[PDB]
UniProtKB/TrEMBL annotation, chain A:
GO terms for molecular function: structural constituent of ribosome. InterPro entries: Ribosomal_eL29. The keyword Transcription regulation does not apply. Belongs to the eukaryotic ribosomal protein eL29 family. Residues 14-25 have a biased composition (Basic residues). Mg(2+) binds at G19. Pfam families: Ribosomal_L29e. This is 60S ribosomal protein L29. It comes from Giardia intestinalis (strain ATCC 50803 / WB clone C6). Keywords: Metal-binding, Ribonucleoprotein, Ribosomal protein. One of its GO terms (biological process) is cytoplasmic translation.
TrEMBL record, chain C:
Belongs to the universal ribosomal protein uL2 family. This is Ribosomal protein L8. The keyword Ribosomal protein applies. It comes from Giardia intestinalis (strain ATCC 50803 / WB clone C6). Keywords: Ribonucleoprotein, Ribosomal protein. GO terms for biological process: cytoplasmic translation. The keyword Ribosomal protein applies. One of its GO terms (molecular function) is structural constituent of ribosome.
From TrEMBL, chain D:
GO terms for cellular component: cytosolic large ribosomal subunit. Disulfide bonds join C11-C74, C11-C76, C71-C74, C74-C76. Belongs to the eukaryotic ribosomal protein eL42 family. This is Ribosomal protein L44. Keywords: Metal-binding, Ribonucleoprotein, Ribosomal protein.
Amino acid sequence: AKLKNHTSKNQNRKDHRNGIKKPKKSAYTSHKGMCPKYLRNLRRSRANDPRQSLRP
Amino acid sequence: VAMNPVDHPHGGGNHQHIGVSSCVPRNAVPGQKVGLIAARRTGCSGGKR
Amino acid sequence: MGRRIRVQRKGAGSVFRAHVARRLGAAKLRANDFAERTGSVRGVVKAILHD
Amino acid sequence: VTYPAERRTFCKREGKHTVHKASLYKKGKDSLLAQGKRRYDRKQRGFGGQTKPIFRRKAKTTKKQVIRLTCSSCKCQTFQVLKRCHRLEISRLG
RNA sequence: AGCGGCCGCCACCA
RNA sequence: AAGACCCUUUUGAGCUUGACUCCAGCCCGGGCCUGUGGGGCGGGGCCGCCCCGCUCACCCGGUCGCGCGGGGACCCGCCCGGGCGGGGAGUUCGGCUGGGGCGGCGCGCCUGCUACACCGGACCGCAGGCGUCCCACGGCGGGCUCAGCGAGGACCCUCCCGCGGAGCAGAAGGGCACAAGCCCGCCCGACCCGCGCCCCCCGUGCCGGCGCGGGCCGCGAAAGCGGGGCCUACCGAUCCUUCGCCGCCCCGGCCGCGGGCGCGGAGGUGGCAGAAAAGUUACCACAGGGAUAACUGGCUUGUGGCCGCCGAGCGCCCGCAGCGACGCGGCUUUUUGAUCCUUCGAUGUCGGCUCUUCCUACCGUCCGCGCGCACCGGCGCGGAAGCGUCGGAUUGUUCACCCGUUCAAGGGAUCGUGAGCUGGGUUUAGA
RNA sequence: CGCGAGGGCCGCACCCGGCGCUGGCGCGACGUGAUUUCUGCCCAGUGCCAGACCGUCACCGUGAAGCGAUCCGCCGAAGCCCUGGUAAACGGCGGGAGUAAUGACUCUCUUAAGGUAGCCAAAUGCCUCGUCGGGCAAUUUCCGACGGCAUGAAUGGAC
RNA sequence: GUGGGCCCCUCCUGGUAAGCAGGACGGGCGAGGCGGGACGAUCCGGACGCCGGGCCAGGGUGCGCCGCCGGGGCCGGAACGGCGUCGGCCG
RNA sequence: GCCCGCCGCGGUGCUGACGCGCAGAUCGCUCGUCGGAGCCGGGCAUGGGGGCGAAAGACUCAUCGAACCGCCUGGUAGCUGGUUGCCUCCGAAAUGUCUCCCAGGACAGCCGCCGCCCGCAGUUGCGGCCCGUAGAGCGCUGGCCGGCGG
RNA sequence: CGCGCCGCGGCGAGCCCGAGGGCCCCGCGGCGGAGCGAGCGCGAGACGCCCCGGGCCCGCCGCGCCCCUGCGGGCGUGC
Ligand SMILES: [K+]
Ligand SMILES: [K+]
Ligand SMILES: [K+]
Ligand SMILES: [K+]
Ligand SMILES: [K+]
Ligand SMILES: [K+]
Ligand SMILES: [K+]
Ligand SMILES: [K+]
Ligand SMILES: [K+]
Ligand SMILES: [K+]
Ligand SMILES: [K+]
Ligand SMILES: [K+]
Ligand SMILES: [K+]
Ligand SMILES: [K+]
Ligand SMILES: [K+]
Ligand SMILES: [K+]
Ligand SMILES: [K+]
Ligand SMILES: [K+]
Ligand SMILES: [K+]
Ligand SMILES: [K+]
Ligand SMILES: [K+]
Ligand SMILES: [K+]
Ligand SMILES: [K+]
Ligand SMILES: [K+]
Ligand SMILES: [K+]
Ligand SMILES: [K+]
Ligand SMILES: [K+]
Ligand SMILES: [K+]
Ligand SMILES: [K+]
Ligand SMILES: [K+]
Ligand SMILES: [K+]
Ligand SMILES: [K+]
Ligand SMILES: [K+]
Ligand SMILES: [K+]
Ligand SMILES: [K+]
Ligand SMILES: [K+]
Ligand SMILES: [K+]
Ligand SMILES: [K+]
Ligand SMILES: [K+]
Ligand SMILES: [K+]
Ligand SMILES: [K+]
Ligand SMILES: [K+]
Ligand SMILES: [K+]
Ligand SMILES: [K+]
Ligand SMILES: [K+]
Ligand SMILES: [K+]
Ligand SMILES: [K+]
Ligand SMILES: [K+]
Ligand SMILES: [K+]
Ligand SMILES: [K+]
Ligand SMILES: [K+]
Ligand SMILES: [K+]
Ligand SMILES: [K+]
Ligand SMILES: [K+]
Ligand SMILES: [K+]
Ligand SMILES: [K+]
Ligand SMILES: [K+]
Ligand SMILES: [K+]
Ligand SMILES: [K+]
Ligand SMILES: [K+]
Ligand SMILES: [K+]
Ligand SMILES: [K+]
Ligand SMILES: [K+]
Ligand SMILES: [K+]
Ligand SMILES: [K+]
Ligand SMILES: [K+]
Ligand SMILES: [K+]
Ligand SMILES: [K+]
Ligand SMILES: [K+]
Ligand SMILES: [K+]
Ligand SMILES: [K+]
Ligand SMILES: [K+]
Ligand SMILES: [K+]
Ligand SMILES: [K+]
Ligand SMILES: [Mg+2]
Ligand SMILES: [Mg+2]
Ligand SMILES: [Mg+2]
Ligand SMILES: [Mg+2]
Ligand SMILES: [Mg+2]
Ligand SMILES: [Mg+2]
Ligand SMILES: [Mg+2]
Ligand SMILES: [Mg+2]
Ligand SMILES: [Mg+2]
Ligand SMILES: [Mg+2]
Ligand SMILES: [Mg+2]
Ligand SMILES: [Mg+2]
Ligand SMILES: [Mg+2]
Ligand SMILES: [Mg+2]
Ligand SMILES: [Mg+2]
Ligand SMILES: [Mg+2]
Ligand SMILES: [Mg+2]
Ligand SMILES: [Mg+2]
Ligand SMILES: [Mg+2]
Ligand SMILES: [Mg+2]
Ligand SMILES: [Mg+2]
Ligand SMILES: [Mg+2]
Ligand SMILES: [Mg+2]
Ligand SMILES: [Mg+2]
Ligand SMILES: [Mg+2]
Ligand SMILES: [Mg+2]
Ligand SMILES: [Mg+2]
Ligand SMILES: [Mg+2]
């Protein structure tokens, strides 16, 4: 009629069993959420740099 | 009232009793038209003519 | 929700038909015809019977 | 509960703030030629009773009133939804 | 929501 | 004998009705069937009703068609429309839960505590709150300082000190002084277009919040600030309906109506990730369940029952012959609860009768001591379980209550004992 | 209680049937249950019924508009609504305070009406093994009395 | 596949309490052979292929039943009582 | 529709016998009724949501709170039972969220296998920020015994 | 029988015993090759061993500026 409600008894062991993972190396440098005005200026400067540009 | 409810609309109950009024209307369907059919009045009182 | 009640079963007939065996017949006046329609006709009482 | 008779706010048709007059929005009457109504009628033809559900278990004692704001200069309509409330009236000053 | 004058009668796909 | 009691299953059935959704049947109206004439009323400038002759349709009688009738353009029948309609049909009748039900609502949210100083952490745990209220009780700028204590003033005014002891809509916690409070002035950022993040979290949705790019504005000398009301709660998918921008389509063409589509709001699901839904069964069921009650047993001992410690008092005097308040410490499982471990493909479920054995917390008898023990008769204690503890009236009774006698303790053994009985009670189907 | 045959109640898919070889001293539907003595109050609720067309309430029909589909008006049968009747229809039938140990008397709140005549710890009384009398040596049983958890008048009361 | 868990040690909540009910880090049984705790799923050691030798953990060493001697002392349960015996502290 | 009482028709008590029966309802003794709403035989009629019922939900061929026969039908079951050779290598969960969910599922976690590619840690030390529990205490919010001095 | 993923065989900007017709011979669709947009419709080169990320191009939604055949073309900016 009544069963158990809650435990976290085995959960820290399950959490450790494969090691604690780390997020990908490129999420630290994702542009997402940065200022768009800064991102615009970045694109202009590289686009007009003759050593950095990739225009054909 | 001496019957079971399957046999008659007056049947059943822990005391023998009809349960609702036994004046039924004129346009009741067959199976319903038991008791006193379309009675102008009821009871036993004197003084008619 | 029920069965058919007693008044509903009487219309079909069967065991609820009239007991007519050994009845004398249907009781009627004499049929109106020319002679009664224009005059009078005579009869004689032959029997008085229980039906 | 009390709403100004008149308000100055943005208009899209002109692209700048103008003066608008308030009124109360109300749902219009149902057409007989809307497609869902046509489908409902065709499904309800014949024997078999009710073919769609009928909502019973009702809880809210309040709807969200919406104000129509009609632009004075050009007659562009805009709507403002208000928080739930029990009584509402618009002021009367034009 | 619909007629009439708190009331009648009527109506009902999120 | 795959419990029939009890519970669960999105398994039934009989019965009921103000459950939900309907069907026969009956009542009512127009139309067709359906002729041939005469009249009255009203309206609009031909139309709608109403009435009453005739016989020839249609219908009813009598007669062996033996020397005859009655109704009548109405009734029936048919089509469509409205009402009555458990007589009948199909189906439904939430969940959590120290068994279910009555009750309650941690079923969607919020504060403090439980919670053991990152985060997280249960209960029908504790103390409570939410479904609202405000064009100002909102935005901005300026000025001001609150609650009060003390001291003064004819029968509210003034000074002085004043860390907030006031106020800031409503629970609680947090926050705030040339302010976030109060007063004055002007206002409507309680706007438009397009993105991202936080909380909850499966890193899905929903409420709520935060950070931006671009329009258009408000207040301010200006720097600034502003997408409501200081912060933590105050709310809602698909399909359908309704409304508003700018357009696109209707597929052989074009035009006008109309219909549809892309974007956004509103109408609501509180059982709040959102079926459209009333009872009864003592006539009964099906699949299962010891995941779960009713009876033995087990743990516990509040309640019941029994035993100690202390010594205010009682006892003519005299705390302890006999007693012993206010307190405190234990034992037992012969009461009743609390719980749900074993048993639902079944452990026969009250008492009495019959018969046997056991315990001692000893009522009479035995052996010792004590007395408020002269005798008699009573009372208190230690050892002691051999023998004894009975006959009847009323009650199914265990119990109790009375009468009588050689004067009459208390218990256990599956609440000993139904292939030993009996069947009074309880405990199916009749009434 | 209903019905005078062009009817009523019932059967029945349709055509056609039963009561009926019948006619109110009849046929059909219900309740109570020999005799004797009786059968009180309530039409507010629910049910049934008849008398008027106020509101509401169909299709058909008809007016105005329109390119048309269609939109809007008018018209208005039965039913409900309104006005009454009916309890041997279903059913229902009282509180507080005093006042000569009681309470004939009174004041008051209140209902549609406030349980009459009767009967009773009853096969109906919880408390309850009620109180008193009879009977017994002794009686939770029995009989006679007294007066209501929740007695009572064709739910038929009492004998 | 699983989404009925349970127990121990420490830390807690309701309850007179419970082999009662509800939570927390770590470990165990579940799904862990062997020896020991007389006897027990979980305690004390130790966690496992088939054998021969050696060393020994936990517990123990009168006989059942594998294994011992030496030395120094003494001789289930509450409040409350004891001039039983051996040892102390304060006067 | 009187009384005693035989055959007949019925079925009270013994809660008798039997209860692996003589028997899927029988036997013994006792008992109700016996001129009548009495008992018996044949023919005929009424058919399943129907009949028939002096009414017990009774009876309708050992079947009745809805007969029997064949088919739809190997009806559906989140529920109970069972599910057949060997060795080797690995090896769990009994938890979170949603669900007419609570004896069932979906997503996540935990595990197996198949791969593909080129520093790390369930630890200590050193350095920097964070927490409000045990203890302590009465300044804050509350509670609480008393004694001096004016 | 249908859906997903993995392995292996043949051929590869291609691929393929439909049905049918003369274990052999001939044999259409279809799928792939371009996407995005409700739809009118418009329509991809710029980089790279491989993988991941950056940049830029195409469509849908919005907006500067110039023009030819014009609510049409070109060139740009933004999520
Ligand atoms: K009845
Ligand atoms: K029924
Ligand atoms: K029937
Ligand atoms: K029937
Ligand atoms: K019927
Ligand atoms: K019948
Ligand atoms: K539409
Ligand atoms: K229908
Ligand atoms: K079973
Ligand atoms: K069962
Ligand atoms: K059962
Ligand atoms: K149960
Ligand atoms: K059951
Ligand atoms: K089932
Ligand atoms: K069911
Ligand atoms: K049944
Ligand atoms: K049923
Ligand atoms: K049944
Ligand atoms: K009905
Ligand atoms: K049902
Ligand atoms: K997650
Ligand atoms: K929120
Ligand atoms: K912005
Ligand atoms: K919606
Ligand atoms: K849907
Ligand atoms: K919409
Ligand atoms: K079963
Ligand atoms: K179960
Ligand atoms: K179990
Ligand atoms: K168990
Ligand atoms: K105990
Ligand atoms: K149990
Ligand atoms: K038990
Ligand atoms: K059982
Ligand atoms: K047994
Ligand atoms: K057993
Ligand atoms: K003795
Ligand atoms: K009557
Ligand atoms: K009679
Ligand atoms: K007399
Ligand atoms: K009488
Ligand atoms: K009345
Ligand atoms: K009346
Ligand atoms: K009435
Ligand atoms: K009386
Ligand atoms: K008596
Ligand atoms: K009465
Ligand atoms: K308790
Ligand atoms: K293991
Ligand atoms: K293990
Ligand atoms: K000592
Ligand atoms: K005889
Ligand atoms: K009998
Ligand atoms: K015998
Ligand atoms: K027999
Ligand atoms: K006789
Ligand atoms: K018949
Ligand atoms: K038959
Ligand atoms: K049947
Ligand atoms: K059948
Ligand atoms: K068959
Ligand atoms: K068949
Ligand atoms: K079947
Ligand atoms: K099932
Ligand atoms: K099942
Ligand atoms: K089986
Ligand atoms: K839910
Ligand atoms: K359900
Ligand atoms: K679940
Ligand atoms: K289930
Ligand atoms: K699964
Ligand atoms: K303090
Ligand atoms: K092929
Ligand atoms: K588009
Ligand atoms: Mg991991
Ligand atoms: Mg009966
Ligand atoms: Mg009935
Ligand atoms: Mg404008
Ligand atoms: Mg069974
Ligand atoms: Mg379920
Ligand atoms: Mg059912
Ligand atoms: Mg439940
Ligand atoms: Mg804010
Ligand atoms: Mg009974
Ligand atoms: Mg159990
Ligand atoms: Mg005790
Ligand atoms: Mg259990
Ligand atoms: Mg047995
Ligand atoms: Mg036995
Ligand atoms: Mg027996
Ligand atoms: Mg009677
Ligand atoms: Mg009575
Ligand atoms: Mg336990
Ligand atoms: Mg052993
Ligand atoms: Mg030895
Ligand atoms: Mg006789
Ligand atoms: Mg006789
Ligand atoms: Mg099968
Ligand atoms: Mg089957
Ligand atoms: Mg391994
Ligand atoms: Mg679990
Ligand atoms: Mg739901």
